[model samples]
Target: MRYEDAYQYQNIFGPLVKLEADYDKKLKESQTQDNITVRWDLGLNKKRIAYFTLIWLRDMRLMQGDEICLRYKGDLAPLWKGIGHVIKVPDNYIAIELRSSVGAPVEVTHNFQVDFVWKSTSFDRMQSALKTFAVDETSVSGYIYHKLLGHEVEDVIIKCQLPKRFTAQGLPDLNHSQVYAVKTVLQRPLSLIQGPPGTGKTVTSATIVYHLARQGNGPVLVCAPSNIAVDQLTEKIHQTGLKVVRLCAKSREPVSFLALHNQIRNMDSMPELQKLQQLKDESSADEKRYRALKRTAERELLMNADVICCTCVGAGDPRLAKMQFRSILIDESTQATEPECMVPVVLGAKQLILVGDHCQLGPVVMCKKAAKAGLSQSLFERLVVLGIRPIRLQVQYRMHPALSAFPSNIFYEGSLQNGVTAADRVKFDFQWPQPDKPMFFYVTQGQEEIASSGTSYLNRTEAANVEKITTKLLKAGAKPDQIGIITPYEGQRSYLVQYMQSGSLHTKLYQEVEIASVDAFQGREKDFIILSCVRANEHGFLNDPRRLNVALTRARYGVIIVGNPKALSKQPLWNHLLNYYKEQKVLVEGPLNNLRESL
Candidate 1:
């Protein structure tokens, strides 16, 4: 093992950091939109909100709290720019908060240009954490430092004061496997917890943290790849009667109700500070003292908290730079690239538990060169490859037994135990090929086309079938929220949403259903899922078996897949699924009421 030095840590993440940074910058900088008109006002928070309009009907990848570069100038290419923070949306007009404007003309707002600003905060944090891990000898324990770099260090363990019960006060009672996973994690320096979809990942994670903090160890650290994951865990951890402080990026603070900043702003006994904040909000005065006072208050709360939750990258925040997190748990660890995971690991993690399912979709690496260079591989997946076994929570309480059957056999070593029975799931009086079987593969020999974007695939016929199935379920008394529609490409996603809305008897009910990509529906569940496989001519994104696993596992009550059987059967994996469907007599090719079994 050479009892390895820290330089090697840099060697591994260095190229990924460079590659991802370059790609993100290029992708963000290239998205230059122009000719935006603006109406402005100052908010109660002392920030200026600029109302504008943008008719971005073509598959927008934008969202609130995202960063954008703004200028009220030429559309072609603006020489002047200022930072704009995304705020409001869809009133026939959009609005953004002008976070700061340095020497930009804003007296008039006829023509404006906006570019998606790629804040390198996350990447920069990744590099910073990597560098800190390499250069700073105090970044982590000597044993952990070596173990992280794959150096052959002697296995280590930390024995905590075992709690009398693994179950927490506010969370659901842990099943046998969930309790076993919690007790096993407390001893190991590095543990991987594989939570198959519908298994209680968040429940297990929250229980682990409760016991970890109960041992009177310093505040426990919790993180996830995305802020949403952190918030979900944060909510559960809060229910366990622990003082949870959710650290948020500054850009995201506006939208976060549980952010550290917002918490301190409402702190009791801080009348003077609150008054100053109020004055600042009304008159825009005395920011220096207000900021200083806020920081002190934030530090106070952070120190008193029982658990600190944040995204993996948020762990590298300067506020936590000098702080060490000896006990850390990262939820959704498989969704982040290695470098992104390192952002939290380098924060002095001694006893670390990584929670995620390896069978599901992995990290999204946008750059071809970096992805091919293995940048997409997650630390949890890499650890699995290194022969570290993950503790699988076998009993899944999310899906019906019939719904879980194929996914369990194909992905979970067939060891997955169904916690819920077929009778436990909702059985709508909808058309089914088999009376008991609530799932079927609808054969749609649809024509595929490259969308207007020229990069995404769209199938009109499959989309129409999806609408019919959706309306069928709606008429059968299925609530709109119970059903979810997932497609593989942006083109079909856009086409399906509109088609469903227009064809639906109640457009609001249709609009209430979430239509998204497989990547978007990974960690969530729906009562019913309609998967529109737009790839008929060739096996596209469906070639990745992980994506299909996610799509199949999302539905709890039933699943309906719309795709051409012959086209899908060309792939061996899809071929097996189709064959299984046929054997079950659930592969049909007729209308909703009169389904005929396919050959």
Candidate 2:
């Protein structure tokens, strides 16, 4: 499947659409502190107006109430990127409420192509992939594609048949799970790698990519849903001494040192990139020189790369048009929408590797209608539900035995094994007694109320209790960086951060401690974790077991959970957790237990 053939079959190439609108410098008097509206016009071909309308309305309706990136000028790495929500979409015009201030674009003409690459408009490409099943029924992708199209494939025992195992220098002693995953990627045209928290999915995926490149597999494209995940993969792959290029939007800042070292989009590597932007910004600049320099830089970066890494959206960059990859590896595949996952899948990649834990937090679709309409499920999870058994990385290196047991039994069906190192298992001397049992359930009867954001809630009493627990940990010799505060709601997270910052903790250890929502802590870990279950009601709205699973599995040594047990016990998952703690004698009723007083 060549890039041109895929494009032709999918009917993807068209006049890249661009918005033609005059820049207005005047700030409207109606602007408020929370939102600022901007007007834009779709100066597109009236014949293609319907197509733009479909994409625009659907993209907005699907991601409503959430912040999305809006490229103002053009997609050759957008000149001005607006982080905003689509507030209104009228005929021939659209209004966005900007979350952050951005420069108004000065557009001359609409020359860029606006192919609906991010949208799920490529029914033909999907059909082409599906058609491959009839020709070759052995490939895993074909099997999965067949099931996705409502065909049932019989489950059979497939042996691991590989010509050779991966051999690379500087690589650590590979674990059985990692080795198995690498072997599957080598032997099968398509494979799924299920990685829970702290599992070495990235290491395994990178090893597969390294061997793929070493075996002279044509240029591989590695993609993820977030820049952070892609950067982590890029870093891992870079250590293999392979030639890698990290494709990034022009609007993105240089964040990864590995990308800079590879001379992809770093300041030193492409000083001319900024220089061209400066020239374009000038009133009387050299347009001809700017265009030529930009063209040359983009061409070189795309052609000479052995491995390319980028986000899902970055995969659709026009600069990558006509490019064909031998194999595609997508990290965090379980966290992206199906269309987002397909963004790179349609780039003429024959083999595919999707690695993520579908049981955890999935695609963060904002619209309830879109979510119910199946926009929230990832392609990886969908395939798993269709009877595709992923090579599960069963051994986890994070969380103590006690903290890991609940999620393992409740979510992983008692399959998760404790494979942490001795250093990780070492006990932390805490101010409280019974430090051997590193899990704690503090019954804080805090009132949970929705925040002004309407999407988040907070528990003030729970926040205070969490602050006390954090202070105790710091006083008992835990380093600031070793502790993490995870809250289920943005309101609780904000309160915790503000409380820590305003008090003595700010000058002492708050700066080093990280407080974030569970979604932000999905791929992260720490030695100690304090979780605030902000929902203290009996409505069962906070019964998202996936979020609780992620929150509990983030700590290497200990986890402190503060919440209203009476309210939480109404949920089956929380009821089971509290019962487990009670049976184990690790549940504490009120404030911290004083071992000295009890003695």
Candidate 3:
């Protein structure tokens, strides 16, 4: 090899060169430090939190709960070790303490970046951890490989140079003293990231895109199932200093071009965004302009931009459209059926990252063949039969540990054996709390008991009982916002959403409450979920067994079921529930032995 050529290669591969300091130095040589200030609240869960910006590498420190601690990058390079003093600060301010380095005197602005899981093992562990929650997903090292291709070789070298600040970044850590290292790892070339609630799927997906853009990958496509989720992700990525395209049903036709143009302009402040902008007179021209923009933009612009964020409806599937999609990340994809999820899959994804909670709800379309095959159908079976096995996410960050138990049994298929407690067998509140343990059964005193139980079921007259129970729950400290009125069928749900939201039956409960059924809550959340099995008849007994699963799992803190207890137990679906209750020793045969008295 030519020695001079090696010198050029050295400069290309060298740590100092990798840091981009030479170029940033030039940019800084003529320009001054940015005076624009970005402000954000330091704490959401904490009484107070801290804040800091990218600073000189040498002056950086690891953040802690009680005090500010300086950290030195021994030989760990990206992963820094704590080898310094704890800086004391006023109790009132954790935010400002981060801005001022005590005794370090290193005030130079050193660029800092949130660490994407660097070690290959971290990404692997992340997927494994998610499995604990019974989140079904395919594991691929594709993310790692794709991430590598996304950044400029030098950009990665710069990342490798810094000491790792494991604790201070990403999702807030509740257990401060405990190590919060990456729970999941990605293999890279990850065309998709399917996540359920708080597996940090959205954030992790965003971080992956950020790494791609940082690597000079242009236009990384990002898409979701709902407008709310898309907007949420857009805001989050922006906060990370990445300019993301927001596509919704309400989005303007011309906005795609406008967004691209604006993204380029924001590149200085939004380094996470690559510069690729264009304006067009027509939709046809927009595609042409987009093509040109991709061609002219830096590798970052291409890699970052190639990442588009939209819905399945917006992006047509290549199997149908006969077009191909490049790399893409589809979050909350399970809500979408095979055809819907395939829109992006067939578009042009050489690899597809399909992130969804298998334990959540599957696509709305009911396939007969799929049903015969069983509920364990993979996205590949419906969407991409020839594609790889579906990925999974196993983390459960949303529901309280107790509230999560019910869904664990139904969705995860009993993977979490010790999931429920005896306390779970009983409702937290007589009127509205969900019992995570097995469903309780009653051996009626006589045939009249069955009749009485049947009458209590959510028929037109019996729905009044639901209102009464809801009122009791609200009086007992449940927020209406936290409450949900869920049912088995869309028809049942339609009536209830209107009734709960209207002033008719649930008048007081109507105030400040969100009323929706399983159909409406595909990718939404609530604190307390109230389910009314409106019609638990002999005709397929309360209709779809699947809908029952949907209604039970919506609540995070608790759930309340108001229906004909006898009618519910008579159904095949509830028979197992009844059996489970029997096994748990909750059901007792005799006179209406203090059912109400226990409450």
Highest-lDDT candidate? 1
Give the range where candidate 3 is weakest over 10 consecutive residues by summed lDDT.
56-65
After aligning candidate 2 to the native by TM-score, how far in Å is the CA of 308 from where it should be? 0.7
- List candidate 2 segments past 4 Å from native: 1-32, 35-167, 252-290, 421-423, 427-429, 447-458, 501-508, 590-599
Q: What is the lDDT of residue 79 in candidate 1?
A: 58
User: What are the lDDT scores of the predictions, listed in order?
Assistant: 0.78, 0.63, 0.42
Best by TM-score: 1
Clashing pairs in 1: none
Model 3 / residue 160 / CA error / Å: 11
TM-score of each: 0.89, 0.72, 0.52
lDDT of 3 by residue, 1-599 (tens): 11123233223223322233233333323432233122223332222222433221111112111132333332323432222212222111122333222233233223322221111221222222223112211222223222312322221112241124332224443221112212122233332333434356655555545444444434555666543455555655565555465443212112333244344444564332233231331166556755554434433432334345665554442112322344566767666533344445433453345666655565532234433433234342333233333444445555555545555675565443222344433333343112444233323211111222232323543345555445655655567777776654444433444455533335555655555456555556677666666654443125455555666655566555555555676666676655554555555333221343121
As for TM-score, the candidate ahead, 1 or 3, is 1
Give candidate 1 misplaced runs (Cα > 4 Å).
Answer: 1-4, 34-65, 70-83, 87-113, 252-257, 269-271, 283-285, 451-453, 501-506
lDDT of 2 by residue, 1-599 (tens): 11223233223211110000000111111222231233344322111011112100122122222334434444434465445443323212133333344344434223222221123322233344433323433323544344444365554333543436464545565677778778867776667889988688778888888877776546788999866788788878888888777775543223345452235333455676666564444233566765566667666766766788987766676677677776889998998766567777766555678999988878765444556656567879877776669988888876777677888898989988788754457464475435566776777777777873676677887887788788878766579888888766667766776788745455756767777666656777888888778788776225788887888888888887778777778888888998887777777765564633110
lDDT of model number 1 = 0.78
